[PDB]
Symmetry: C4
Subunit: 192 residues, 4 copies
C-alpha cells in the first residue's frame, strides 16, 4: 500500500512534467510504458533499506535478488564465492525498451552490462548484425578492458533488464580477483 | 497542480528568508522576479524523473528539450549525432537577469555557456564592447581551452536563458570527439 | 514518540519490500531481528543533529557516546587526547549478527573495526580458529597497514556492535599521530 | 511561521536523541543553548534557496550577508572586488561557545576562520596566551600556508560567530589572486 502510493505519487508528477515540456505523444507513451514495465505500480526503494542494514544483510539480499542471473551467467561457474558476492553488491539494475541503443559504436564506455532478461543485437559499424545475445550473457566489456572505444553498437530487440558494472567497480573486482580478468580477456578476444 | 503547490511552497519560505536577512527591497525584488521568470508559478524537478528512467529516455528527453538550441547553434551543424547527444545530456540550465555579469575578465573559469535566448555584451578590460552575442551563440570557451583566465567580461542585456557545460564535461566531450576540439579552437582564435 | 513513529514507518516499508522480493522466511526474519536489535523500536538520526551543531559539540557528543569503548580499548591508554578525539569523530557504528562473516580471508579491506560489544572468531585459511576477540579489542587493521589482503576471516559468535574506521580515515589519523602507527604496527606483527 | 515550525520540529527530536543517549545535563544544556543562540527559534535553509537561483543572485546575497564582516577585515581593504566576491561565496558560517577550542596546537588543519563577532585567545604550547583576537580578525591560516601543523591553540572567550574557508577553497582563491597570498604570507610571518 505504501509502495503503491509512492508510485501513483510519482506518475502524477511525471505526467505534469511531460505536459510542461510539451513532449510528443510517442515519447510520453514511451515514458509511461517504462514506468509501468519497470515498477508495475509499486515503488519501494531498496537503497534506503540496504543503507540501514549490515554489510552481511546487503550481501545476503544482493545474492538472493541476483541468484537467477548468477546461475544463468556461465562466467560465474566455478568462480570464487567472494568474487560473486563482490560483483552482485556492485551491480546496478537498468531497464531498456525495444529499439533502444544501450551502446553506440565508437563512443567511450563507462560501464558493462549483464543480461538478466531480454535479447539484444550486436551491430557492426557497417550495419551487419554480428550476433544476438540474451539471458545470462554480457556485453560492453571490451571497451573497459582496452580503455579505448566501443567496437560495436548494442540495440535492444525486446524489453531488457540488465545489471551494469561501472568502469571503476569493474577495475576494482578484476584487481581483487585477477583470475577473472584472465577469463574475461579470453572472451573479449573470442569476440573475434 | 502539484507543480503549482511546489512553487507557492518555495516562494513563501523565500520571502521569509529575505525577511530574516533584511535584504534591501531592490534585491528582494530581483530574487522574486527571478523565481517568477524562471519557474512561472510551477516547480517540477526533472532531476528526479531523469534518475528514475533509462539512459535512453534521458537522451531522448534532453534531445527534445534542447532541440531549438541545437538547431540554433551553427557549431552543431554536421556534428556527429553521438556528440550532440553527449553534450545535451551534460548541459545545465541557467537563467540570468539584465545587467548580470555572467563572466568577469581576469578570473578563472569553471564552465562555458550556450545561449538559448537572450543578448549579452562582450566587454574588454578597457571597457569597450567588442561585440554582442545572442540566441545560438556561445561564450566562455576560451578559458577552458587555454586553462588560463577569462579574456573579457560578459554582461547580460536582457533576461538570458543559458545552458552551461562544466570544465570537466567540456574536456570529456572534446576527448571523445576530437574533431570538435579542432572546430572549437578555430573560433577561439577567431575571437581575435 | 517521533523516534517511535520513524521506526514503525521504516519497518512497514521493509516488510513490503521483502514481500515484493519474495525473500525466504529465514532472511526476512534475519532482517527484522536486525532492525529490532539495532534500533529497539526507535530511529533517531544523529547525522542530522551532528551537522546542525559546532565541531566542538560533535566532538563532545562523539567522546561521550564512545566513552565506554575508549575505556575498554588498551590501545587508547595514554594516547594523546587529540588522537582519541579525532578517531571517535570518524568511527562508524555497525551491527552484525551471529555467524556473520565481517571479514573474509584473501579479499581487499576497506576499513578496520573496534569491538564495543560481542565475540568474534579469527579463522585461518585452513579453518583453524586462531583466537577469539571481544569487547575492547580490534581487528581488520593488518590489511590497512600492508595494503595487501585480509590474512584471516572474522566471524561473529554473538550479536556484535562495532565501530569501523575507513582506510582513508585510518591513514589520516596515523599520519596526524605517527606514534600511534608505531604502536599499531607492533600489534600487527604480534598477531604472529 | 514556516521557519518557526522548522525549529520547533528540530528541537523536539534533538531532546529525544539526547534522552536516548542519556547525555549529561551539562551537555544537553550546551546543545540547547547552541540551538537557541544560533537559530533563535527559526530555521530557514539558505542552501536550498542559493541552489535555486543564479550565480549572480548567490554573489549578491553572499556579499550582502557578509558586508559587515568584509568591512571589518582590514585584509579586504583595497582588495579586488572579484577576490572579495569569490571568498564570501565560499565561506561557511560556524558558531562556537565560550571555552570551546576551535583549534588545538599540534594537529592538522582543514580550514581557516574569519571572526564576525566574538573574542578568542591564542594559547601557545606552554599555555601562555600570546594575544586575543576579535571582530574582523582571522586565524588558522598558518597551517594552511605551511601545510604543517597548528602552531597555537585558539579558545573562545565568548560566543563566536565565524566564517571558515576550507583548505581546498583557500588554495583556490590564493591561486586565482596571487597578490593576496603575498599579503597573507606577510601576516603569517608577523605572527612572530
Ligand atoms: N562478435 C561479437 N559477439 C558477441 N558480442 C560482441 C561481438 N562484437 C562485439 N560484442 C560486444 O558488443 C559490445 C559493444 O561495446 P564494447 O566494445 O565495450 O564490447 C562489446 C562486446 O561486449
Ligand atoms: N571578440 C569576441 N567576439 C566574441 N566573443 C568573444 C570575443 N572576445 C571574447 N569573447 C568571448 O568572451 C568570453 C569571456 O570568457 P572566456 O575568456 O572564457 O571566453 C570568451 C569568449 O567566449
Ligand atoms: N592471531 C591473531 N590474533 C588476533 N587477531 C588476529 C590474528 N590473526 C589475524 N587477526 C586479525 O584478523 C583480521 C583479518 O583481517 P586483516 O588481515 O585486515 O587483520 C586481521 C587481524 O586484525
Ligand atoms: N602571535 C600570534 N598573534 C595572532 N595570531 C596568532 C599568533 N600565533 C598564532 N596565531 C594564530 O593562531 C592560529 C592557530 O593555528 P594556525 O597555526 O593554523 O594559525 C594560527 C594563527 O592564525
Amino acid at each position: 500500500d505504501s509502495s503503491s502510493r509512492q508510485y501513483r505519487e510519482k506518475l502524477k508528477q511525471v505526467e505534469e512534467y511531460m505536459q510542461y515540456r510539451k513532449l510528443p505523444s510517442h515519447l510520453r507513451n514511451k515514458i509511461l510504458d517504462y514506468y509501468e514495465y519497470r515498477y508495475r505500480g509499486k515503488m519501494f526503494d531498496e537503497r534506503h533499506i540496504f543503507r540501514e542494514v549490515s554489510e552481511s544483510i546487503r550481501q545476503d539480499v544482493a545474492n538472493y535478488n541476483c541468484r537467477d542471473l548468477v546461475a544463468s551467467v556461465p562466467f560465474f561457474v566455478g568462480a570464487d564465492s567472494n568474487f560473486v558476492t563482490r560483483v552482485v553488491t556492485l551491480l546496478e539494475f537498468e531497464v531498456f525498451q525495444p529499439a533502444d541503443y544501450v551502446i553506440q559504436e565508437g563512443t567511450f564506455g563507462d560501464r558493462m552490462f549483464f543480461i538478466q532478461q531480454g535479447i539484444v543485437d550486436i551491430i557492426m559499424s557497417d550495419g551487419v548484425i554480428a550476433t544476438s545475445l540474451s539471458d545470462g550473457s554480457y556485453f560492453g566489456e571490451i571497451c573497459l578492458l582496452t580503455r579505448e572505444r566501443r567496437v560495436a553498437s548494442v540495440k535492444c530487440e525486446t524489453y531488457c533488464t540488465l545489471f551494469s558494472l561501472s568502469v571503476q567497480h569493474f577495475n576494482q573486482v578484476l584487481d581483487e580477483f585477477p583470475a577473472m580478468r584472465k577469463t574475461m580477456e579470453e572472451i573479449a578476444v573470442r569476440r573475434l
